[PDB]
Design a protein around this ligand. Structure first.
Ligand SMILES: *[C@@H]1O[C@H](CO)[C@@H](O[C@@H]2O[C@H](CO)[C@@H](O[C@@H]3O[C@H](CO)[C@@H](O)[C@H](O)[C@@H]3O)[C@H](O)[C@H]2NC(C)=O)[C@H](O[C@@H]2O[C@@H](C)[C@@H](O)[C@@H](O)[C@@H]2O)[C@H]1NC(C)=O
Ligand SMILES: *[C@H]1[C@H](O)[C@H](O)[C@@H](O)[C@H](O)[C@H]1O
Length: 494
């Protein structure tokens, strides 16, 4: 289509949102030039410009030098979660407005997401508590079934998303709680775990539940890339935990995967589905990786390690991600859940917040710089309150839906995310990037599967920083990174 620009609107915070409705939504180099996409606090939204690649460079300004031969992880991708709350919000819009929201995310005219996390039954971003097997003591799982949250809300929206998408989309599933008749405390929330011990009928049934969920989704012609072994297993170890959870120590998780979940999936028609362990705060690394992955019976089933961002302030990426990679380089690290406005003192939704967009890109760049292969936002959309949410655990979302007005707002988080998701396709590989002097920039460089280069530069300071990027193959890009800007640079080195 033609590029339609952002309709900006201010809500009194540091930047603007882009206004989208039933009929309007904003949407989207020759050798040897580069493309630059820029977003700024002042209001630019992924604006395209071009520049020449020079042969020479002189000066003592900041130089960032690509090391195309230092090769690191391959990227799996970027996306968000299709919760009950996200489905209810999107379906609240008229169908044309719904198409423009899905296109914003999934289409090539939008920012190209290729990952969708799907909860297995209810979480806090549900308006009802339920599992797929609520009939008590149904150990055979005869009464297992998907309710309308799945069959009328989530499943059809995931289908629209795959139809709009240019890139292959990977589905990732995670459970919050099991049926309560499987749990020590008999409740969806609170402190409690599976009854018994791995290897027994409870653990066997819980592993069969995963296969039943996959069978059920496959009947609706949806197939999964990966499942996690539990969302935030540490939560269910905490007294009074307020919403759906299921606690595992790392030993409990090791032995569940070894004796029940890994063999159950390996013996099912879904043996190709990857299993991710942890799915919890990175400060749990490297300890959890060492407990699970040094048992060869558990390690043979574990494809990767899922991390969440909520305690990153306590957990230096080098001592957590870097050290895990050093010990277990062949087990991919993947960021599976992030959102702002989740601390009890923070405002849930701050329409137009630039700070919250910068938190997203700063996290993404730091994760890429420490071997992480992908990054998943939480709810795809929320209402202006940051809900619905059965326990009022409201948070922020890159897209806020205003149903009484059939309109949605794209926040700075949406664009900060798009500066990566749009321009780093599955298969791209991170390469070296070194700075000539101390600076306030955050930057990462990658190579696309066709060998072209992509560099994202975030300026977290208020000062404009002139800089040059050196590609030792090709030449020099002379540029400036304005204070509170994010830029993505692209060029063919072919
Ligand atoms: C969906 O969102 C679009 C984009 O904002 C709305 O269309 C826009 O309406 C604007 C104001 O209503 C128009 O801009 C104005 O231009 C006029 C003269 O041309 C000036 O008097 C004024 O100062 C404004 O700047 C503009 O035509 C249009 N914007 C774009 C870029 O398309 C739209 O509103 C619905 O259609 C438009 C064309 C208006 O006439 C509305 O009143 C109309 O109901 C939004 N749709 C809905 C349902 O609100
Ligand atoms: C991750 C975060 O705690 C988020 O706020 C919460 O809503 C999810 O349920 C949890 O898994």
């Amino acid at each position: 289509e033609f590029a339609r620009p952002c309709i900006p609107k201010s809500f009194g915070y540091s930047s603007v949102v882009c206004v989208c409705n039933a009929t309007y939504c904003d949407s989207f180099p020759a050798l040897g030039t580069f493309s630059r996409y820029e977003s700024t606090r002042s209001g630019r939204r992924m604006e395209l410009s071009m520049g020449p690649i020079q042969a020479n460079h002189t000066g003592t300004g900041l130089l960032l030098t690509l090391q195309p031969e230092q090769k690191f992880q391959k990227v799996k991708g970027f996306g968000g979660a299709m919760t009950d709350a996200a489905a209810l919000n999107i379906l609240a819009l008229s169908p044309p407005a719904q198409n423009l929201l899905l296109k914003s995310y999934f289409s090539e005219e939008g920012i190209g997401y290729n990952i969708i996390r799907v909860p297995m039954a209810s979480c806090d971003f549900s308006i009802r508590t339920y599992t797929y097997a609520d009939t008590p003591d149904d150990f055979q799982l005869h009464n297992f079934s998907l309710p309308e949250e799945d069959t009328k809300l989530k499943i059809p929206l995931i289908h629209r998303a795959l139809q709009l998408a240019q890139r292959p989309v990977s589905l990732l599933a995670s459970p919050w709680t099991s049926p309560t008749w499987l749990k020590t405390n008999g409740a969806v929330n609170g402190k409690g775990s599976l009854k018994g011990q791995p290897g027994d009928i409870y653990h066997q049934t819980w592993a069969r539940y995963f296969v039943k969920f996959l069978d059920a989704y496959a009947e609706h012609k949806l197939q999964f890339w990966a499942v996690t072994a539990e969302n935030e297993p540490s939560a269910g170890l905490l007294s009074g935990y307020p919403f759906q959870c299921l606690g595992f120590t790392p030993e409990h998780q090791r032995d569940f995967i070894a004796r029940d979940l890994g063999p159950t999936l390996a013996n099912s028609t879904h043996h190709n589905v990857r299993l991710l362990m942890l799915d919890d705060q990175r400060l749990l690394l490297p300890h959890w990786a060492k407990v699970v992955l040094t048992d060869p019976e558990a390690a043979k089933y574990v494809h990767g390690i899922a991390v969440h961002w909520y305690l990153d302030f306590l957990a230096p990426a080098k001592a957590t991600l870097g050290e895990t990679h050093r010990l277990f380089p062949n087990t991919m690290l993947f960021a599976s859940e992030a959102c702002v406005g989740s601390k009890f003192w923070e405002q849930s939704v701050r329409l137009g917040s630039w700070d919250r967009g910068m938190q997203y890109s700063h996290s993404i760049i730091t994760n890429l710089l420490y071997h992480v292969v992908g990054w998943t936002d939480w709810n795809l959309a929320l209402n202006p309150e940051g809900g619905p949410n059965w326990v009022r655990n409201f948070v922020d979302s890159p897209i806020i839906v205003d149903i009484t007005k059939d309109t949605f707002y794209k926040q700075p988080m949406f664009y900060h995310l798009g500066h990566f998701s749009k321009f780093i396709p599955e298969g791209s590989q991170r390469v070296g990037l070194v700075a000539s002097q101390k600076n306030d920039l955050d930057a990462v460089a990658l190579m696309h599967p066709d060998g072209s280069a992509v560099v994202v530069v975030l300026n977290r300071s208020s000062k404009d920083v002139p800089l040059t990027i050196k590609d030792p193959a090709v030449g020099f890009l002379e540029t400036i990174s304005p204070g509170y800007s994010i830029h993505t640079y692209l060029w063919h080195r072919q």
